Amino acid sequence: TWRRWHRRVNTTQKRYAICSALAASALPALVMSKGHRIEEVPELPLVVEDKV
Amino acid sequence: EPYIAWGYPNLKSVNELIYKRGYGKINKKRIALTDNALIARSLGKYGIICMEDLIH
Amino acid sequence: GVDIRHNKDRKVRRKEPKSQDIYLRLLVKLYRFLARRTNSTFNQVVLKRLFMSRTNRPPLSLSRMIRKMKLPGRENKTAVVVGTITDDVRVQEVPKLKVCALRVTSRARSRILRAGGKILTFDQLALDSPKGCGTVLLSGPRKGREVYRHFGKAPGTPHSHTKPYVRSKGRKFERARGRRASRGYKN
Amino acid sequence: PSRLRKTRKLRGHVSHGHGRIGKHRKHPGGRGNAGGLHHHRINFDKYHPGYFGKVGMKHYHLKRNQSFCPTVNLDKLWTLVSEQTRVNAAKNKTGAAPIIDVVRSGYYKVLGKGKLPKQPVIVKAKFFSRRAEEKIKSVGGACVLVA
Amino acid sequence: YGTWRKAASLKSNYNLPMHKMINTDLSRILKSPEIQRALRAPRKKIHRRVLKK
Amino acid sequence: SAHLQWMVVRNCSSFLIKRNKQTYSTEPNNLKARNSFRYNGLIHRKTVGVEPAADGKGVVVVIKRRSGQRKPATSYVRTTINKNARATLSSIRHMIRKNKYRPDLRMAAIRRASAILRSQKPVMV
Amino acid sequence: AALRPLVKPKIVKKRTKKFIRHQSDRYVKIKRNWRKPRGIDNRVRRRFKGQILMPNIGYGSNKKTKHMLPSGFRKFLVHNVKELEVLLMCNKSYCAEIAHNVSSKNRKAIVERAAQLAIRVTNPNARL
RNA sequence: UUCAAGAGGGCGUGAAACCGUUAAGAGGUAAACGGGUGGGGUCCGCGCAGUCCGCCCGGAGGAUUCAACCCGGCGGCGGG
RNA sequence: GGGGACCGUCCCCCGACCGGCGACCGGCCGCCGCCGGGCGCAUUUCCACCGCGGCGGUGCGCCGCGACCGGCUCCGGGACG
RNA sequence: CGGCGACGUCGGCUACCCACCCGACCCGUCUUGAAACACGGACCAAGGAGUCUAACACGUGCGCGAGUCGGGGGCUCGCAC
RNA sequence: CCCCGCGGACGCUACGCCGCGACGAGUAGGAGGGCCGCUGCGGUGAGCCUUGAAGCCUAGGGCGCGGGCCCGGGUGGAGC
Ligand SMILES: [K+]
Ligand SMILES: [K+]
Ligand SMILES: [K+]
Ligand SMILES: [K+]
Ligand SMILES: [K+]
Ligand SMILES: [K+]
Ligand SMILES: [K+]
Ligand SMILES: [K+]
Ligand SMILES: [K+]
Ligand SMILES: [Mg+2]
Ligand SMILES: [Mg+2]
Ligand SMILES: [Mg+2]
Ligand SMILES: [Mg+2]
Ligand SMILES: [Mg+2]
Ligand SMILES: [Mg+2]
Numbered sequence A: 001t002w003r004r005w006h007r008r009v010n011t012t013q014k015r016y017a018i019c020s021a022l023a024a025s026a027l028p029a030l031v032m033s034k035g036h037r038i039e040e041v042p043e044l045p046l047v048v049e050d051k052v
Numbered sequence B: 001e002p003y004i005a006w007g008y009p010n011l012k013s014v015n016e017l018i019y020k021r022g023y024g025k026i027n028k029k030r031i032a033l034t035d036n037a038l039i040a041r042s043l044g045k046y047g048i049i050c051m052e053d054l055i056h
Numbered sequence C: 001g002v003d004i005r006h007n008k009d010r011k012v013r014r015k016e017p018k019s020q021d022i023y024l025r026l027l028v029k030l031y032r033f034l035a036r037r038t039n040s041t042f043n044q045v046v047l048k049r050l051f052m053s054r055t056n057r058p059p060l061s062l063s064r065m066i067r068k069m070k071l072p073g074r075e076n077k078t079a080v081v082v083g084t085i086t087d088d089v090r091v092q093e094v095p096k097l098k099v100c101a102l103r104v105t106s107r108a109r110s111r112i113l114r115a116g117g118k119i120l121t122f123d124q125l126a127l128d129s130p131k132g133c134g135t136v137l138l139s140g141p142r143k144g145r146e147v148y149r150h151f152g153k154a155p156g157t158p159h160s161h162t163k164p165y166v167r168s169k170g171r172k173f174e175r176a177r178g179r180r181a182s183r184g185y186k187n
Numbered sequence D: 001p002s003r004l005r006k007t008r009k010l011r012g013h014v015s016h017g018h019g020r021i022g023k024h025r026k027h028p029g030g031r032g033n034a035g036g037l038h039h040h041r042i043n044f045d046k047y048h049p050g051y052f053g054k055v056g057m058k059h060y061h062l063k064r065n066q067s068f069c070p071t072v073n074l075d076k077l078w079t080l081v082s083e084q085t086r087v088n089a090a091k092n093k094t095g096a097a098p099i100i101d102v103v104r105s106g107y108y109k110v111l112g113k114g115k116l117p118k119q120p121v122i123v124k125a126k127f128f129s130r131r132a133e134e135k136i137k138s139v140g141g142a143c144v145l146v147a
Numbered sequence E: 001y002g003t004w005r006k007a008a009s010l011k012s013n014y015n016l017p018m019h020k021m022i023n024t025d026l027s028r029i030l031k032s033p034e035i036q037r038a039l040r041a042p043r044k045k046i047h048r049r050v051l052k053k
Numbered sequence F: 001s002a003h004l005q006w007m008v009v010r011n012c013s014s015f016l017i018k019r020n021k022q023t024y025s026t027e028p029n030n031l032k033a034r035n036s037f038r039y040n041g042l043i044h045r046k047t048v049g050v051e052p053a054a055d056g057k058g059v060v061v062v063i064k065r066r067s068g069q070r071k072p073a074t075s076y077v078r079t080t081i082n083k084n085a086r087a088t089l090s091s092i093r094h095m096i097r098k099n100k101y102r103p104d105l106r107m108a109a110i111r112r113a114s115a116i117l118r119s120q121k122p123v124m125v
Numbered sequence G: 001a002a003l004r005p006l007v008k009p010k011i012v013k014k015r016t017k018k019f020i021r022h023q024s025d026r027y028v029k030i031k032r033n034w035r036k037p038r039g040i041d042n043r044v045r046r047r048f049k050g051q052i053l054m055p056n057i058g059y060g061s062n063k064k065t066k067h068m069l070p071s072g073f074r075k076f077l078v079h080n081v082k083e084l085e086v087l088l089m090c091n092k093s094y095c096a097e098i099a100h101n102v103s104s105k106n107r108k109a110i111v112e113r114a115a116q117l118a119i120r121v122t123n124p125n126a127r128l
Numbered sequence H: 001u002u003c004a005a006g007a008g009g010g011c012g013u014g015a016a017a018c019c020g021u022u023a024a025g026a027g028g029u030a031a032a033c034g035g036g037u038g039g040g041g042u043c044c045g046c047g048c049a050g051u052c053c054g055c056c057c058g059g060a061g062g063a064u065u066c067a068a069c070c071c072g073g074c075g076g077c078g079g080g
Numbered sequence I: 001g002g003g004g005a006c007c008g009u010c011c012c013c014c015g016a017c018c019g020g021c022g023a024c025c026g027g028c029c030g031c032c033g034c035c036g037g038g039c040g041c042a043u044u045u046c047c048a049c050c051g052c053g054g055c056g057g058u059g060c061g062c063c064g065c066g067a068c069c070g071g072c073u074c075c076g077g078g079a080c081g
Numbered sequence J: 001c002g003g004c005g006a007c008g009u010c011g012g013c014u015a016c017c018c019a020c021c022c023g024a025c026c027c028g029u030c031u032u033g034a035a036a037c038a039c040g041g042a043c044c045a046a047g048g049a050g051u052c053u054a055a056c057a058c059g060u061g062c063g064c065g066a067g068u069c070g071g072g073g074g075c076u077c078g079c080a081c
Numbered sequence K: 001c002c003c004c005g006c007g008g009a010c011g012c013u014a015c016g017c018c019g020c021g022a023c024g025a026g027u028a029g030g031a032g033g034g035c036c037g038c039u040g041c042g043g044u045g046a047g048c049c050u051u052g053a054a055g056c057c058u059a060g061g062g063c064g065c066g067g068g069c070c071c072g073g074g075u076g077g078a079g080c
């Protein structure tokens, strides 16, 4: 049971993975390459009103 | 001495060795002497610019 | 059969970065083209430094960069380091510097910019000086590492001043026999 | 990842890299630091001089806190205050010198490695080295002791 | 997460990571007149082995 | 940037097919359908694609406009050409060459248009 | 009749026979799959004359004709019609074939579509 | 009966070793193996009068409309 | 203890000059291209068929033959010094 | 440039059986030396042996950098994940 | 100052493609590559499948130097 299942990742690492993930989510080629069918989406940094 | 056979080549032997089997060490590569420009590029500074100069 | 030895045929050298950093790979592409299509030996040195490991790209402190920039005849020249530029809190006056680096520490970056300096990346350096003209190629201390204190002759040999590997430092840890004449020998 | 290791490449090779003649056996040469003065003497003498024997005086019930005395050098001295402090003092017309309390910053002794900028300063510390005191007075400063 | 000229106001110590390559447009950089002026002419003729007659 | 986006999807993409010592890419606007920086139909500011018409006759020439690169809904302009093969190839040639709109894809688009039209004519007995 | 490849070079095979494992003829427990002999006294490993030959890189096929079918095409496995259109511009160099698990109804559509796109199918009549 | 007993109460699938029978071939240097051919056999090749397609020429037929102009729409590039 | 002043970073604005409209976008123009609809209704254009037609490319269902050119090689004649 | 092509033939060096010529001792293992009168192995199936923890050392990759690191704790609807 | 022709092959997964030269024995051992193979997890294939999954059998067709893999036929019956 003491196989060391967990890993610690530096906080600056982890914040920098989030920034890369967010920046990639605004580029159509990368989101399409994940196969998300963003063919008719008006704008990929896609923002809706607070009413939702 | 036991590993080699050697002697004194004559003019014809030098000609046929250079013309039939003459290869130049150009940029560390074994390049066949098909053109005079290959000889002149690497040996022109010494006055040797053709196969005849190399044979001489 | 031919009489040669094949143990040195394969030269051991970096032909590419072992990193998967796509930004580093992009500017390796840029400087692979510049080294090939120019006669500038500066591009050749920069390209091969881009392949190098982190231990072979030691950080360059701000003090060391300033000191090399202050040498005569290096005014209005770009300081180029293939690695990280580091703030040195031991200096109090930062002059105006034109700098190209792979990476600059936030505090060092603020100090350079506040002093009227300019910071370039290697893509901008290619546009500024494609052949590297008017540049000073600097390097951090390559042997400024703790490992090099342990390298060399063995500690238990005469006239060797190499640091031994000890879990602790104290009077009880490897200071007796073989270290003083009273305890057998010293060498 | 076990898929990246030599074991995956040593399948089909009978000795698993340990060799046919010498084999891989339990503990040839002893266990741990066995035979450090006998059959492993050369390694211990070559790489760990001083390992064997006693040197010095022992001290029962050592309390590391009593000997607590962190040190700071003069080259790092001005980093203990704000950048506002040092520019204000430099451009100050009077002879007013700022006070640097190294005990507040967590240091007890002021060592004298490096050089100081040419401006006076009052340095408060528990201990001063001889050369640190000399350099502080050279720039027109003063050293005052605290307990 | 902040800007490159503002630190993050909800992380107390974080700032956006910096680019090691500002302009990642390789085609535009290589076609720039500054780069093209410094280059030597391309060697595009292929020299295949000559059969030694 | 095209080069930066290429370094991300050159080996990691949902359109990537790697089988039988071959590699293919199935993104919508990939002429020749090959995994390459030149022919990738997603990473470039301007791209051209040739597709069969919605019905069984003609071709659809889709180009990428320059304005809304982050707005995929209006980023592609689709035109339908339903004339004879020689006239259809001339229109595609003029769209690419006269506009200087990616001239490196001229023959790829023309060859693909020929393949589509050749597939639309009825089979023989 | 059949769709012809763009070019049909003469395919030269250095070896036409399989490399069988040493002593796979003497035991059922040992399969014909090749395994490098590593015994200290093995005469096959030592390359004695008249023994079982060992595969090596010298037997490699010409890169121009590698993976080429006898028909001059190279094969791409397909599972549906959508994967078939990747070969539209590779018609004269690559041939499609349908995966074994594809149903009889679905591979009928693949064969029909491939006939239209002039793609050659190695197994066009495979469930019928 | 069952869709199926080529699922029949230790019954899903049902390998190898080993055995029976049928078919083919062979047989005094134990078998087995590597290389090279030859013979026979089972199959494969829509094999069986053997490619396709670009331009041009000639013959015999159809279809609009070919170019250029007009209107509209949409794009690319340039603009102190 | 507050509250102030100052300093460093900011902020949205009131405004001008500076480099450019950029890979941040619109409107106007100019050129070009495509599409749709008219007109153009035939020495134009396009479609399919035929010729045992020509020019190119690829390649011949199978089994064969010849020719010249070049590379390597082993030999044989003739003549000259 | 020639010959030949459907119920008899054409091509398939792979794959099945057979024949002949040449070559060919049974593997594994210890060993200076194994075909050994050296040991293990009748045959087939399934199982079957450098792993995990800790500690070092060096190399490489990543982040930050004279700093670095929250791993213990605490705060976030208390919990599909 | 291209224009009776408005036209002109391929390429460059830059971790790609191309050229030239030399070289190739190997136990113990070291290293690299593996679109070799097994099982499970996160993504992805608008993947496959009762119009037949896995598995198994096969004088069937092939691919790879090889590890192995794909396809045809049969059996099988729910997954891959
Ligand atoms: K070396
Ligand atoms: K080992
Ligand atoms: K070998
Ligand atoms: K059953
Ligand atoms: K035995
Ligand atoms: K914690
Ligand atoms: K999956
Ligand atoms: K293989
Ligand atoms: K099956
Ligand atoms: Mg050799
Ligand atoms: Mg060797
Ligand atoms: Mg070995
Ligand atoms: Mg074994
Ligand atoms: Mg052993
Ligand atoms: Mg084979």
Ligand SMILES: [Mg+2]
Binding pocket: G023, G024, G025, G026, G027, G028, G029, G030, G031, G032
């Ligand atoms: Mg066997």
Ligand SMILES: [Mg+2]
Binding pocket: G040, G041
């Ligand atoms: Mg041996």
Ligand SMILES: [Mg+2]
Binding pocket: H004
């Ligand atoms: Mg059944």
Ligand SMILES: [Mg+2]
Binding pocket: none
């Ligand atoms: Mg049963």
Ligand SMILES: [Mg+2]
Binding pocket: none
């Ligand atoms: Mg039987």
Ligand SMILES: [Mg+2]
Binding pocket: J029, J030, J039
């Ligand atoms: Mg033994």
Ligand SMILES: [Mg+2]
Binding pocket: none
């Ligand atoms: Mg003995």
Ligand SMILES: [Mg+2]
Binding pocket: G041, J034
């Ligand atoms: Mg033996």
Ligand SMILES: [Mg+2]
Binding pocket: J036, J037
């Ligand atoms: Mg004996």
Ligand SMILES: [Mg+2]
Binding pocket: J039
């Ligand atoms: Mg024994």
Ligand SMILES: [Mg+2]
Binding pocket: none
């Ligand atoms: Mg047994």
Ligand SMILES: [Mg+2]
Binding pocket: none
């Ligand atoms: Mg026994």
Ligand SMILES: [Mg+2]
Binding pocket: none
């Ligand atoms: Mg097993």
Ligand SMILES: [Mg+2]
Binding pocket: none
């Ligand atoms: Mg070798």
